[PDB]
């Protein structure tokens, strides 16, 4: 089993597609195993359950 | 050959299938957002 | 083995008339077409997986 | 190819009734947000 | 008004299993 965010029935759910997802920004390559890119920033992607 | 037109209108049917799935995903979100706003 | 076209969800099959004496039951599972050869052909020129 | 139109015609009219339900129902928000 | 809302939902949510049956059978009809 798993729980996941309710996509219907949650007034603030937004559909962020892969290129726009960030977590560990500044500390990972952009969409690749290539060297780290970007800046530190609050992560947006996985909503807390 | 019939394949060109049979492919055309099966492509038309999947385009109108993909229309209703994309657009029922809109109404479900909307009626649920209004149910939430009234809740 | 019976085929299942890509994106299909239903596989109806039939056997026209048969004697079923000492039949033990059915066992089954699903395979990819790519991930299995034909045989009875001495070579399979389309078996491109390994 | 005949029956494939008989589907598509019902499909386009189902889309019309569904879009009518959407574009009507959102106007209850426009009332309730004006009433608040 | 909440009770006429559940009534609108009883119609509008009986569309989902319908669209699912339709979007299922419309994928039976692509292959033979």
The minimum CA-CA distance between E5 and chain C, rounded to whole Å, is 36
Kindly state whether D35 is in contact with chain B, defined as any CB-CB distance less than 8 angstroms: no
Cβ distance C7 to E28 less than 8 Å, yes or no, reads no
- Token digits of residue B21: 């799935």
Resolution, Å (one decimal):
3.3
Would you say D15 and B17 are in contact if contact means Cβ atoms under 8 Å apart?
A: no
Kindly state whether E26 is in contact with chain C, defined as any CB-CB distance less than 8 angstroms: no
Residues of E in contact with C2 (CB under 8 A): none
Experiment used for this model = cryo-EM
Q: Which of C4, C44, C28, D18 is nearest to B25 (CA)?
A: D18
Distance CA E16, CA E32 (A): 28
Angle at C21 between CA C28 and CA C3, to 5 degrees: 30
């Amino acid at each position: 089993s798993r729980q996941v965010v309710d996509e219907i029935n949650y007034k603030d759910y937004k559909a962020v597609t892969l290129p726009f997802q960030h977590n560990n920004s500044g500390f990972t390559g952009y969409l690749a195993p290539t060297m780290r890119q970007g800046q530190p920033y609050p992560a947006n992607f996985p909503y807390p359950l | 050959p019939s394949s060109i037109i049979a492919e055309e209108k099966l492509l038309a049917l999947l385009a109108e299938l993909e229309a209703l799935s994309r657009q029922l995903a809109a109404l479900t979100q909307q009626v649920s957002e209004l149910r939430e706003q009234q809740q | 083995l019976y085929p299942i076209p890509a994106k299909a969800t239903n596989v109806p099959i039939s056997i026209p008339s048969r004697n079923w004496a000492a039949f033990r039951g059915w066992s089954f599972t699903r395979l990819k077409t790519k991930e299995t050869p034909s045989l009875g052909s001495g070579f399979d020129p389309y078996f491109v997986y390994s």
